[PDB]
Design an enzyme around this catalytic site. Structure first.
Site, mmCIF file in Angstrom:
data_model
loop_
_atom_site.group_PDB
_atom_site.id
_atom_site.type_symbol
_atom_site.label_atom_id
_atom_site.label_comp_id
_atom_site.label_asym_id
_atom_site.label_seq_id
_atom_site.Cartn_x
_atom_site.Cartn_y
_atom_site.Cartn_z
ATOM 1 N N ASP A 259 -12.919 -15.013 -19.854
ATOM 2 C CA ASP A 259 -11.933 -15.702 -19.018
ATOM 3 C C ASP A 259 -11.857 -15.135 -17.606
ATOM 4 O O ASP A 259 -11.645 -13.938 -17.421
ATOM 5 C CB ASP A 259 -10.555 -15.640 -19.694
ATOM 6 C CG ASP A 259 -10.579 -16.211 -21.102
ATOM 7 O OD1 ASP A 259 -11.501 -15.840 -21.860
ATOM 8 O OD2 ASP A 259 -9.691 -17.021 -21.457
ATOM 9 N N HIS B 206 -9.883 -16.684 -14.787
ATOM 10 C CA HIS B 206 -8.562 -16.859 -14.188
ATOM 11 C C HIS B 206 -8.479 -16.402 -12.735
ATOM 12 O O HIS B 206 -7.724 -15.482 -12.407
ATOM 13 C CB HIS B 206 -7.508 -16.120 -15.012
ATOM 14 C CG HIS B 206 -7.295 -16.699 -16.375
ATOM 15 N ND1 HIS B 206 -6.865 -17.995 -16.575
ATOM 16 C CD2 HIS B 206 -7.463 -16.164 -17.608
ATOM 17 C CE1 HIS B 206 -6.779 -18.232 -17.872
ATOM 18 N NE2 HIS B 206 -7.137 -17.138 -18.521
ATOM 19 N N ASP C 13 -11.548 -21.261 -18.771
ATOM 20 C CA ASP C 13 -10.331 -20.637 -18.245
ATOM 21 C C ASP C 13 -10.678 -19.991 -16.913
ATOM 22 O O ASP C 13 -10.507 -18.784 -16.703
ATOM 23 C CB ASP C 13 -9.765 -19.606 -19.231
ATOM 24 C CG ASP C 13 -8.717 -20.206 -20.155
ATOM 25 O OD1 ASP C 13 -8.626 -21.454 -20.227
ATOM 26 O OD2 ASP C 13 -7.987 -19.441 -20.813
ATOM 27 N N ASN D 288 -8.687 -24.149 -22.281
ATOM 28 C CA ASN D 288 -7.431 -24.885 -22.373
ATOM 29 C C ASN D 288 -6.741 -24.985 -21.008
ATOM 30 O O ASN D 288 -5.977 -25.915 -20.757
ATOM 31 C CB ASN D 288 -6.496 -24.290 -23.458
ATOM 32 C CG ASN D 288 -6.087 -22.842 -23.197
ATOM 33 O OD1 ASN D 288 -6.923 -21.959 -23.015
ATOM 34 N ND2 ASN D 288 -4.781 -22.595 -23.211
ATOM 35 N N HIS D 289 -7.036 -24.056 -20.106
ATOM 36 C CA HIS D 289 -6.434 -24.115 -18.787
ATOM 37 C C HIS D 289 -7.059 -25.250 -17.978
ATOM 38 O O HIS D 289 -6.358 -25.940 -17.242
ATOM 39 C CB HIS D 289 -6.571 -22.764 -18.078
ATOM 40 C CG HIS D 289 -5.545 -21.764 -18.514
ATOM 41 N ND1 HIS D 289 -4.423 -21.475 -17.766
ATOM 42 C CD2 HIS D 289 -5.426 -21.057 -19.663
ATOM 43 C CE1 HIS D 289 -3.654 -20.636 -18.438
ATOM 44 N NE2 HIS D 289 -4.240 -20.367 -19.593
ATOM 45 N N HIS E 159 -10.544 -16.758 -24.501
ATOM 46 C CA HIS E 159 -9.187 -17.196 -24.841
ATOM 47 C C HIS E 159 -8.182 -16.140 -25.320
ATOM 48 O O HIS E 159 -7.074 -16.067 -24.797
ATOM 49 C CB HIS E 159 -9.267 -18.324 -25.880
ATOM 50 C CG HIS E 159 -7.955 -18.991 -26.165
ATOM 51 N ND1 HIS E 159 -7.195 -19.596 -25.184
ATOM 52 C CD2 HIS E 159 -7.293 -19.193 -27.329
ATOM 53 C CE1 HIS E 159 -6.125 -20.144 -25.732
ATOM 54 N NE2 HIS E 159 -6.161 -19.916 -27.032
HETATM 55 MN MN LIG Z 1 -7.444 -17.289 -20.695
HETATM 56 MN MN LIG Z 2 -7.383 -19.907 -22.993
#
Ligand SMILES: [Mn+2]
Ligand SMILES: [Mn+2]
Ligand SMILES: [Hg+2]
Length: 219
Positions: free
Chosen positions: A20, A22, A49, A75-76, A186
């Protein structure tokens, strides 16, 4: 878009998979530079993500426009896409760090909106064949005891489910037939985990700065 996407590893020299992101763009770029990544030869696969909570969101989301960057949606990305959708609700997205979008300059907002559209073209699962070895990449999990290319699946489970890693941490460990290794993100953890033939590489880069990249081919 298509749920599954195959990648022929023999078409690249080195191949890596990153957890991830981010918005941790600068962190990523320094790593690639540190490992000698060559975008003209190597390939980087992402578990998704790419945005939210972090600082350089547009810069990270933009990576999906580069040939050497192959990501699966997280999911983001889904919350961003649904949130920006004509009939979508941003509530959920804002409750998960999507605020950066409404804090962009006019120029960037337009760019971000176009990139979100491209993100909706991202697959849910990536099958990578490397040296007679098969690797499956999903954001959260592959909700089946057995993997099968093209097998219909609920996207929500592929990008939100934590039930498998949860049982694995409770002692209940099981292998997933169909491929050699599975790689997910995740669910954050101090160090990369591995239960059966499943790997978890989300080491919470946005939280502490530890971004993990695993090499799956070359070297
Ligand atoms: Mn994440
Ligand atoms: Mn996630
Ligand atoms: Hg962390």
């Amino acid at each position: 878009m298509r749920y599954y996407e195959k990648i022929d590893g023999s078409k690249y020299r080195n191949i890596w998979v990153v957890g991830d992101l981010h918005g941790c763009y600068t962190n990523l770029m320094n790593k690639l530079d540190t490992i000698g990544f060559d975008n003209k030869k190597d390939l980087l696969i992402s578990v998704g993500d790419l945005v939210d909570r972090g600082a350089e969101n547009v810069e990270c989301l933009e990576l999906i426009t580069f040939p050497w960057f192959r990501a699966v949606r997280g999911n983001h990305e889904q919350m961003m896409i649904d949130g920006l959708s004509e009939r979508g609700n941003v509530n959920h997205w804002l409750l998960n760090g999507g605020g950066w979008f409404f804090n962009l300059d006019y120029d960037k907002e337009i760019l971000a909106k176009a990139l979100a559209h491209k993100a909706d073209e991202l697959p849910l699962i990536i099958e990578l064949v490397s040296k007679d070895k098969k690797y499956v990449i999903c954001h959260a999990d592959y909700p089946f005891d057995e993997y099968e290319f093209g097998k219909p699946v609920d996207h929500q489970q592929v990008i939100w489910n934590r039930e498998r890693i949860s049982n694995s941490q409770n002692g209940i460990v099981k292998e997933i037939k169909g491929a050699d290794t599975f790689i997910f993100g995740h669910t954050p953890a101090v160090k990369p985990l591995k239960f059966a033939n499943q790997m978890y590489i989300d080491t919470g880069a946005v939280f502490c700065g530890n971004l993990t990249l695993i090499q799956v081919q070359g070297a």
